[PDB]
């Protein structure tokens, strides 16, 4: 399946209360696959991650971080 659909499937398997915490851990982990990422780019990655629960139709639909 396509990546976004796999993402929403993995996220859906996480408990609602754990989805925002888990997305924060994903942003951290994604940085390891890149190395030197500036603070502006890090903030953007959290912004993108923040949108994923709505895209997925998953509560809660936004993560403050």
């Amino acid at each position: 399946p396509p990546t976004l659909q796999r993402c929403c499937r993995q996220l859906r398997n996480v408990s609602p209360f754990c989805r925002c915490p888990s997305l924060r851990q994903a942003v951290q982990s994604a940085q390891q696959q890149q190395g030197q990422v500036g603070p502006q780019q890090v903030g953007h990655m959290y912004r993108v991650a923040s949108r994923i629960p709505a895209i997925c139709n998953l509560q809660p639909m936004r993560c403050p971080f």
Binding site: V14, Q33, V48
Partner: peptide
């Protein structure tokens, strides 16, 4: 702790990591 365990168990949200990288180029 519950959330960490669920993250690890769901493949460390590896596809979401891919999403987040895709829109962060």
């Amino acid at each position: 702790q519950r959330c960490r365990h669920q993250f690890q168990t769901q493949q460390r949200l590896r596809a979401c990591q891919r999403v987040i990288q895709r829109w962060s180029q």
